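Hey all, quick one. A colleague (J.T.) asked me to put the QUS job into the tracker so the inputs and the structure tokens live in one place instead of scattered across chat threads. No bug as far as I know, just bookkeeping. Sequence used:
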Amino acid sequence: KHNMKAFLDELKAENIKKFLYNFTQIPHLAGTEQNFQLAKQIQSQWKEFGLDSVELAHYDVLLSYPNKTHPNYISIINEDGNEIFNTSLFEPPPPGYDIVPPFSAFSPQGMPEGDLVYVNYARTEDFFKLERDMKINCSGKIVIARYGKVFRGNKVKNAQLAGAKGVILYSDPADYFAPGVKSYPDGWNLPGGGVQRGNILNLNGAGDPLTPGYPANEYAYRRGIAEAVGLPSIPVHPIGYYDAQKLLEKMGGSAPPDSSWRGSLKVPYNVGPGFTGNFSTQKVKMHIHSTNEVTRIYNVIGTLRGAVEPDRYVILGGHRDSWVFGGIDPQSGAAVVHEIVRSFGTLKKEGWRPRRTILFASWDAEEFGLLGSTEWAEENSRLLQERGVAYINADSSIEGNYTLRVDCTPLMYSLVHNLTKELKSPDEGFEGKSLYESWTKKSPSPEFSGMPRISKLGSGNDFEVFFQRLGIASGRARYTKNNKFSGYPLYHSVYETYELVEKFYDPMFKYHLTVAQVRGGMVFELANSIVLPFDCRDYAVVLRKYADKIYSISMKHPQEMKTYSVSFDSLFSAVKNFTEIASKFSERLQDFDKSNPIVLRMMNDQLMFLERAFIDPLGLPDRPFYRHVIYAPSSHNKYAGESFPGIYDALFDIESKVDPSKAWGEVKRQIYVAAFTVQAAAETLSEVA
Amino acid sequence: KHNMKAFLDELKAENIKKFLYNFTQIPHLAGTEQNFQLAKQIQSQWKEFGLDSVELAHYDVLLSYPNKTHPNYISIINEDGNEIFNTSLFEPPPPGYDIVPPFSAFSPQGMPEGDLVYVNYARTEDFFKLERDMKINCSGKIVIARYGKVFRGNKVKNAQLAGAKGVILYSDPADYFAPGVKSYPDGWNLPGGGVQRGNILNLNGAGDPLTPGYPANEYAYRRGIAEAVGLPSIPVHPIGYYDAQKLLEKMGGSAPPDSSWRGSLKVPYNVGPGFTGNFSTQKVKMHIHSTNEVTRIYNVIGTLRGAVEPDRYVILGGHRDSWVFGGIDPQSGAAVVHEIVRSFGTLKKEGWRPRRTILFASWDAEEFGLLGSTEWAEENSRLLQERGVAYINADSSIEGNYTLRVDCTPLMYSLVHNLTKELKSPDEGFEGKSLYESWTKKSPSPEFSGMPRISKLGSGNDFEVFFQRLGIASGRARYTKNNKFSGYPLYHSVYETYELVEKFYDPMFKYHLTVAQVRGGMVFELANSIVLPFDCRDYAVVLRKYADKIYSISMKHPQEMKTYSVSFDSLFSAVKNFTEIASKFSERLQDFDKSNPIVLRMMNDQLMFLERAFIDPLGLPDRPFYRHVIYAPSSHNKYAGESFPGIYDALFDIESKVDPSKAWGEVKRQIYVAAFTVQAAAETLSEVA
Ligand SMILES: *[C@@H]1O[C@H](CO)[C@@H](O[C@@H]2O[C@H](CO)[C@@H](O[C@@H]3O[C@H](CO)[C@@H](O)[C@H](O[C@@H]4O[C@H](CO)[C@@H](O)[C@H](O)[C@@H]4O)[C@@H]3O)[C@H](O)[C@H]2NC(C)=O)[C@H](O)[C@H]1NC(C)=O
Ligand SMILES: *[C@@H]1O[C@H](CO)[C@@H](O[C@@H]2O[C@H](CO)[C@@H](O[C@@H]3O[C@H](CO)[C@@H](O)[C@H](O[C@@H]4O[C@H](CO)[C@@H](O)[C@H](O)[C@@H]4O)[C@@H]3O)[C@H](O)[C@H]2NC(C)=O)[C@H](O)[C@H]1NC(C)=O
Ligand SMILES: *[C@@H]1O[C@H](CO)[C@@H](O[C@@H]2O[C@H](CO)[C@@H](O)[C@H](O)[C@H]2NC(C)=O)[C@H](O)[C@H]1NC(C)=O
Ligand SMILES: *[C@@H]1O[C@H](CO)[C@@H](O[C@@H]2O[C@H](CO)[C@@H](O)[C@H](O)[C@H]2NC(C)=O)[C@H](O)[C@H]1NC(C)=O
Ligand SMILES: *[C@@H]1O[C@H](CO)[C@@H](O[C@@H]2O[C@H](CO)[C@@H](O)[C@H](O)[C@H]2NC(C)=O)[C@H](O)[C@H]1NC(C)=O
Ligand SMILES: *[C@@H]1O[C@H](CO)[C@@H](O[C@@H]2O[C@H](CO)[C@@H](O)[C@H](O)[C@H]2NC(C)=O)[C@H](O)[C@H]1NC(C)=O
Ligand SMILES: *[C@@H]1O[C@H](CO)[C@@H](O[C@@H]2O[C@H](CO)[C@@H](O)[C@H](O)[C@H]2NC(C)=O)[C@H](O)[C@H]1NC(C)=O
Ligand SMILES: *[C@@H]1O[C@H](CO)[C@@H](O[C@@H]2O[C@H](CO)[C@@H](O)[C@H](O)[C@H]2NC(C)=O)[C@H](O)[C@H]1NC(C)=O
Ligand SMILES: *[C@@H]1O[C@H](CO)[C@@H](O)[C@H](O)[C@H]1NC(C)=O
Ligand SMILES: *[C@@H]1O[C@H](CO)[C@@H](O)[C@H](O)[C@H]1NC(C)=O
Ligand SMILES: *[C@@H]1O[C@H](CO)[C@@H](O)[C@H](O)[C@H]1NC(C)=O
Ligand SMILES: *[C@@H]1O[C@H](CO)[C@@H](O)[C@H](O)[C@H]1NC(C)=O
Ligand SMILES: *[C@@H]1O[C@H](CO)[C@@H](O)[C@H](O)[C@H]1NC(C)=O
Ligand SMILES: *[C@@H]1O[C@H](CO)[C@@H](O)[C@H](O)[C@H]1NC(C)=O
Ligand SMILES: N[C@@H](Cn1oc(=O)[nH]c1=O)C(=O)O
Ligand SMILES: N[C@@H](Cn1oc(=O)[nH]c1=O)C(=O)O
Ligand SMILES: [Ca+2]
Ligand SMILES: [Ca+2]
Ligand SMILES: [Cl-]
Ligand SMILES: [Cl-]
Ligand SMILES: [Zn+2]
Ligand SMILES: [Zn+2]
Ligand SMILES: [Zn+2]
Ligand SMILES: [Zn+2]
């Protein structure tokens, strides 16, 4: 037969290993010739594998690159203007190895000099502690912050609003060196010369900074750089912990407020400002000369037309561009997509086609702000909004070898639970056990016994435009470690190679195979199930949890809720209604005359448009491209999903607002929008007439 | 059989006459008890007629009413503060007759006194003439303007931006008294004591001023009045031409610039400012005391469930609220809807159901800014956007007895042409001829021989939210006179009665019957045709005409187009592509395996979503609720549709902009948005995979 099992069995660990090797021999930086050539290779191979059509979609978008003849670096400078210490101009390359040196993409140019302030992880609460409790002023200071806990662009935005004139980011061994494991090349730890590259823009979903709302095509009109979206106003640069030790060792001023501010280096972790008495006249000086330039990028888009519902799209997408070799990020995911394409193409050659159309994407410029996925979705938004069933992401397949990590819409919970019960666990000690069994044991749900944890979708990857802008049901799955938002030690460093993976992560490629089964199996069921595999009742369950949670946040302020008559009754009413209507729709879905394709499709359309109904066409406050009312990327950490974001942000730090009447008025406004949207979504599941 | 003919034959002129009499015996002002009672009557009758469900949908929205104990009026005041002339406190009621006196809905309160300036129709070009050519300054003046040519709210906005401190609107016999016909009650002309009521808000599609974007339900959070949408900042009041003569007769200052500024009254039509020497110390003083108040309104929503595609909605809607008796506006339309409901209910009782669901609406508060239709569409937007096939409006069926007047999307051109060829003409001298024949003869297309004129949709009625906000294919048809935007003489006056219609417009109710056939026939074909009756090729034809037209406007400025490299090539490319793709889609639509319901539906979905594809989720500049890129209400006249509005507005008066580089940059931006949107819409008609 040609069923899911036939699909799954075709997938081979050996093939994933060969593709991973093939994709990781040279760098594939966005906008470079090497990445265009890999695009053309993937396009050819997907054609050979059996897809009906495979095209390149290109765009001209703002990218950022160091100046090859004018390198970026940081100095300690003495009173006479002598640079007495300089940070590294490049990471020591690994054994046997156009490697872009470490930099912060989209940093403006500058050579600011000044006194350092150490700001821990540069989180909102870290800046609250500094400014409110310690009374330390960052204005005109250079801030130094350790990577970890939140997206780096949130750190830079926080530093800018605190008045900093520059930001230095570094990797502390506390966050990036696991006890008892060796530094690369002899283990998976970050060496002291290692550095994490990364974008520091805060685009809030806009895509190419120059063309928000519209694809960056040949005739696009572009904002002038001065009006560009999300560009930092202060220079930024990343360094390793050997270099950080040199900058931090002389720090004076106030001691760290407590131990959660101290990393693992042999330094006091004094907050500053500036250096201890003897060195009080030395300053820190950044030299940043990178340039932003409009550059062509290329997405590969493959189509396998559906036999019955060709106008319904199930999309599997992940990026192809890497900072350097991309041994984990993204090629461990791209190799998995490649093998999934190969397997579906093998069925197709034997005469099978999926029920619905499957689209496969190799996105470009993910590392520069999700630019390739976003521009393509801007170009195709009408098709996606009326035809998009689901989006399954496929960045790094492994970031560890402990257990599965799934983040997805509630609509896909049942699908994921069911599929993982049918798959074998790759884990040591769980042989002959299901993946559901090993996953639930290793990553228990905080709410339910005998259920695994599944997290919310925020941003930090290519699903963002599909889920947060367009309201297409989305999910992702990967293998992870036992530091959730911080990354594995070699993240975005030159050391992230094929050898790292083959030696230290997944020598048998069994975790890669397990992830290929989860991702491919989801795409299979979405594209082939007669009734779409979504359970609206799972949304009802989480909506009640989110409503209890936001209510509980508000109830920290009982006096104000009394004064301003702040009621959550409308929201709990809407949640109750959703729960009632979803229960009845599910009954009908099980009852409906199963011989009737129009009833089936009406019902499939109700299922497909349910995620769509949580979209507000006006967007969230000051974030027009985040339009989902139930989830958004956290305003404090793009990598984290936040629930009832519009109410959450209205409540955040509200006791500090100068006009409480206005602030609480806006809380009430957001409760109204949320209740209304929950009820309207419920009403899409009512009988249609 | 139960075919269109059975439907059409059931419709009776006699029934339309009886309902019209029934709906016009007492006033039905929005927000009053009499209008709630009529809502309940219609709800009961539609149930009796056979509809599956008939519900009231209510909302609490901002309305406006004179103060019953503190009447509005205007004075001429002498130097001592004596009011030597007062305008009327009410219109003399007609023979044999809670009549709200004449007022301008949403006028703020005030008692401004000052010198008059006469501004003709208060159009943009009239204010250009005053300020730029005549060098007359309206700042701190009271402006007096004749009704006609453009929506009254555009006049008030224009007066406000010119610095006026009040506006007096009046009906000139030039525009409202047809030569050779008697004043009411002895003919259809406006008597000198007659006055036209009407809303003067400029909401740009927002609906209830207090709740833009969300329905005005029980738990709605409301803007404070100071942040309300579209509220005028200066008092406004309407008067008849007896009263206007008294205000205009003493006018001094500059003479009218030319004859197009002179109406038909025996006065010089001097522009002012102020009165001629002898009366130079007399001023004009307004007294406006109306109040805005949140008030409950009621829509009646009837459903006739479709037999095959119940999740596809064809909507026939028109309003029920009137200023006074509503003998033409809206009851000549509401009586027609009532008879259409009755006819469809008669088929339904004999076992027939339409293929798709038909929804019937009796909207409330149209006269206060399209509030009932708009709030309902805000509440139901997700259902409408994913399921809405078409909207056919049904305000006044007759505004004359000369010929048909149709305004609609290009998608409905072929439907209208075909249907009118099948209908008998009611016209004198065209007996035994088709309606298409009499219409084409009396209202020839400016472009094509042997084709009738069909106009563009702007605003000025309840289709606005469906077409301009949501992108649902819409149309309207009525009988009209041989003054297009000015209204028939008795418009919004107490004299608009059942007797006006029965005596002077349509004694046999044959024009009403013809309109019932057009509106009902359209709904029939939309709700019952196996393939939706839309022709995408008709859109391709008009897009080329609109592109030629906007290009021709730009080419008034060749030097600037050279300097700023302003090219329309992308737009003509997109138009060419649309034309090519639509031609191929139409071939497939005629070719497709007609046994395949999924191919049919994919194709019906392509047809239904084509209007939807012209919607831009970011809206037009500073008008977020006008989202259609091909059409919008003119920024100078809400009643007029404008094509390529975003480019048109970018070009308008551009030679007066202080920063030409910026102004032309915005023209280029709008060309990019238009080209992109035309191409994206074209791509929805490509093969789906
Ligand atoms: C969850 O689903 C419920 C339906 O099962 C739905 O219930 C509706 O709730 C609304 C708002 O509470 C009810 O509104 C009332 O409507 C009646 C007429 O039917 C009005 O007479 C009444 O008017 C007022 O009473 C008010 C309250 O004191 C007062 O403020 C006014 O001035 C006036 O006197 C209300 O407007 C409605 O009838 C219910 N519909 C039903 C049962 O069919 C919930 O709204 C829904 N939850 C959400 C969040 O949508
Ligand atoms: C109407 O439909 C047409 C398809 O039939 C479609 O045609 C496309 O037009 C675009 C833009 O003109 C073409 O874009 C070129 O793409 C090639 C690769 O295929 C590029 O090499 C080329 O790159 C450049 O050449 C530029 C022009 O001088 C230059 O600016 C650049 O720096 C670079 O050298 C262009 O990007 C595309 O290939 C065509 N597609 C086809 C034939 O399939 C029209 O765009 C469409 N109209 C609209 C308004 O969409
Ligand atoms: C990655 O695999 C691809 C595809 O097998 C290799 O590209 C092929 O190489 C041969 C020999 O040079 C050429 O004749 C073909 O045209 C290529 N096929 C393509 C591009 O589809 C490529 O050599 C491999 N890369 C590495 C680093 O091993
Ligand atoms: C840090 O690098 C800087 C920049 O290259 C070095 O300073 C330069 O040294 C050369 C040779 O002595 C001078 O001629 C340049 O004028 C210097 N440029 C400056 C100061 O910007 C500096 O020596 C390096 N410091 C260390 C510790 O190696
Ligand atoms: C997950 O699998 C469960 C168990 O098979 C599915 O739930 C069953 O579905 C069938 C078909 O509707 C019903 O007859 C059973 O009553 C269900 N069992 C239950 C709810 O315990 C469920 O549909 C699957 N989820 C998917 C496919 O998304
Ligand atoms: C308009 O017609 C309606 C419906 O025929 C009339 O309302 C009915 O009047 C009778 C007699 O008073 C009542 O018993 C019914 O309850 C009413 N039916 C309804 C409300 O559906 C109404 O009288 C007519 N109005 C005028 C001005 O003639
Ligand atoms: C226009 O109406 C005003 C307002 O009613 C009249 O002025 C009032 O006249 C009474 C009786 O003489 C006075 O006691 C009030 O104090 C007046 N109120 C004012 C001036 O605001 C006025 O007489 C009317 N003019 C004409 C021509 O009839
Ligand atoms: C208007 O009527 C015309 C003439 O009947 C319809 O056009 C015909 O449609 C049939 C069915 O597709 C074709 O076989 C003929 O070739 C068409 N004749 C033409 C184009 O001259 C047209 O479809 C009708 N428009 C509607 C129903 O919207
Ligand atoms: C890179 O290095 C130097 C420094 O200005 C210069 O020659 C060149 O312009 C720079 N390249 C850029 C700005 O792209
Ligand atoms: C921080 O320091 C700078 C000193 O120039 C000042 O402008 C800013 O207002 C200070 N803020 C506080 C609260 O100390
Ligand atoms: C892979 O699994 C083993 C088992 O605990 C472990 O020793 C090793 O550290 C894991 N690799 C990584 C990179 O976590
Ligand atoms: C109407 O008339 C008078 C004038 O102020 C007053 O008694 C009453 O408040 C007014 N009613 C309103 C403002 O609704
Ligand atoms: C119009 O008149 C007022 C006089 O107070 C003035 O403020 C305004 O600027 C004038 N405009 C012109 C152009 O005369
Ligand atoms: C109705 O038709 C006749 C025919 O010309 C005309 O005399 C009369 O004025 C028309 N009624 C109206 C209101 O136009
Ligand atoms: N996955 C990336 C790219 N990045 O993710 C976003 O969401 N924005 C952005 O630049 C990274 O985390 O550095
Ligand atoms: N049809 C009306 C009501 N009016 O139409 C709008 O579009 N806005 C508005 O208030 C009138 O023209 O007075
Ligand atoms: Ca863009
Ligand atoms: Ca509203
Ligand atoms: Cl992922
Ligand atoms: Cl109408
Ligand atoms: Zn990645
Ligand atoms: Zn990455
Ligand atoms: Zn009307
Ligand atoms: Zn009206």
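Adding what we noticed when we looked at it: Residues 1-66+289-533 of chain B form a domain with the Aminopeptidase fold (CATH 3.40.630.10). The first helix of chain B runs from residue 4 to 10.
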